[PDB]
Amino acid sequence: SWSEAFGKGAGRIQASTIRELLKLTQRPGILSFAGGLPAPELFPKEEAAEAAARILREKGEVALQYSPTEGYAPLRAFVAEWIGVRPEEVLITTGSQQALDLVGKVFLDEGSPVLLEAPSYMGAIQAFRLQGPRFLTVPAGEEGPDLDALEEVLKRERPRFLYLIPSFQNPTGGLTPLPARKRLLQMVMERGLVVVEDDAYRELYFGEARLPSLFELAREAGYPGVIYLGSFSKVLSPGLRVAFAVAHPEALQKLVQAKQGADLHTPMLNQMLVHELLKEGFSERLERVRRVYREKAQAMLHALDREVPKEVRYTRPKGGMFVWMELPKGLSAEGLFRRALEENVAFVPGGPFFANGGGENTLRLSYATLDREGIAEGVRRLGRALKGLLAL
Amino acid sequence: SWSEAFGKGAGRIQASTIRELLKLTQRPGILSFAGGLPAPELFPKEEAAEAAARILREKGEVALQYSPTEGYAPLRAFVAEWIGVRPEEVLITTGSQQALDLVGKVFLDEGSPVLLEAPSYMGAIQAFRLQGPRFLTVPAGEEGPDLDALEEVLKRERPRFLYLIPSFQNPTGGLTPLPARKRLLQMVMERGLVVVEDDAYRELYFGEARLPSLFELAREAGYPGVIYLGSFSKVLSPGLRVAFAVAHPEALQKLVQAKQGADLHTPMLNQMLVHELLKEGFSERLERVRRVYREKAQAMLHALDREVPKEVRYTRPKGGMFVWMELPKGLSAEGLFRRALEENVAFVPGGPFFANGGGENTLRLSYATLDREGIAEGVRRLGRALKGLLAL
Ligand SMILES: Cc1ncc(COP(=O)(O)O)c(CN[C@@H](CCCC(=O)O)C(=O)O)c1O
């Protein structure tokens, strides 16, 4: 009997709705506002092809061979220069999703408290839940985490770490403002707490400039407790699975040793390809990806303003890939999903973004994948489904 | 500070000596008998370059995008055809190292019994150790595990699974014979036990044919309890990080959900590239791989027979990448390691292959990486170092 054969871990293991939706959304005719999949037109497939061939011809014996866990050295150096750290502080990971898995392994045990936002990224919840922690949450909004709520929790609990996405939070799109970051840093430093800062959407700001990361603020202050996660997924290629973690040597060593057991190393070809593509013109590329997402966000907001009844509330992003919607408390996002799917529109129901449940009346919308036309038509269909279900 | 902050997992995390040795061995000038790194001239650099470039040009929107966790469909289909199963029974993983991580997560909890050989593959020990299990061991030799010893364990203990490498075991090189495979299957079936069969070296047999796998024997008998692992690492490219697990649907689903949290999915370019490289001429490539390793094995044995004193014992492989050496109780492998390295020769001391300690007089030699001359020359230095150490 498999249920009898499985360990406790298997009982905590549940499928990710984002992961499962991809099987639906990659089918033709589906208008996807579901997974945060980058606009296909942004993939530099032609340039990647030329670079991959060159790597394999000129350096194939390196690209194809086992390599040390820490990563391709020129890639680590590039990340170090970009982030403002030294190459030896950088671990290359197989997507930031891997860094989440690793931090879970290093910090969490059965019953151990961990703190994140409600809602937060379901892939983090999933990775952490494997360890059987006790989730503590504080509400998150358009302005980031409720720091009065956080203050209350920290008087009562000592979380193993705080998992936060200060820049264009998944799924709310929230941007934690600078005074709030500084306040958070103080709260963390006073208690000597660990922060896991997920900066997946770092470069996808729509305004004039990005805000300093918690990690930059900690480094300025000389606080070693921020583990910084970044990824090439949203800026170049999610499919390559190449990302990085930066951390104090002791924490970094454990992440390294956990990674050895997880996959040995991130594939070398992929690391080398990322470095070849980005070593020249990265700033110019980042400007283009910001422009593309800004335009899609603008189209999305215009369509929502037009099509959605004004009893329904939704966030207005200043960056990233997501709009977060809240239905009159009573209306089910899962019910809404069924109706929208009949009209070939997919979104992510909000429930699974809440680590302790609730949020059955919320949903996440991604404007990353569709063109202007698809966004307007998808939202039109959504509005109609919304109006129908509000009536009943 | 960090030690206080870490969870119980951090204390069970230690570095792999194989993984650490690569930092040393990849440097020019060192003759490596350490990590089982495939012969570089076996890498199809030019064909890979053409295939990677074509994949990215024609299918970049797929290769560079997020993809479902289960894997690239034509690859699952290829594997299924090769192994003799259906596509739906295959999970593509990020090297078989990931499969080991995943089976640990699905089956083991703090204090849960796991059974493996003494010695066994250190990457499996390291992956499993994370979960806090109790390692139960049985001795392994040239003919595989001690089945009388296994019987005695099984009367008293119910392991969450048995981890075995019946074909060219790491590190002993042992081949579990067919009668022993059939006996093992009977013990497993009588007690309804789960087996994790790691077949990394499946195709690297030196004789006229391979033995039926425990998975194949199980399937013939209609027993669903063997989880079968394979890899493209030893037959194509380890650096690509592409492997597979085949299992009963309930087991496979939990492995899938655990993988979602581990890395989302194995990189897509890599899977498509493996498929493109192997879709024609796989049998012919396999025959060539077998010839190359047989030759290196022959060279290794020729040189050991001639350079090594007769007090020292070593296995004679019928396949795979390894020779396992036992020093006459009184010699330290760590001491021999110090001496050999002064001579630019690296191997893996045997201790870390023993999950519960021991084996300080043992070491593993790999003939995979060096050519015939390098093997001859490395072994003569090793032999000279050994004799010197034997003298005192
Ligand atoms: C805050 C945050 N951190 C980590 C990740 C994982 O991305 P990588 O592993 O770095 O590609 C993500 C993934 N974001 C998208 C992409 C997931 C798409 C998928 O799993 O199919 C989403 O939530 O839809 C994230 O939002």
Ligand SMILES: Cc1ncc(COP(=O)(O)O)c(CN[C@@H](CCCC(=O)O)C(=O)O)c1O
């Ligand atoms: C029985 C067995 N199972 C799984 C693995 C992991 O290989 P993949 O992740 O499939 O590349 C291995 C890897 N074997 C080699 C290669 C590891 C090289 C390295 O970690 O640098 C060794 O033990 O030296 C293995 O022997």
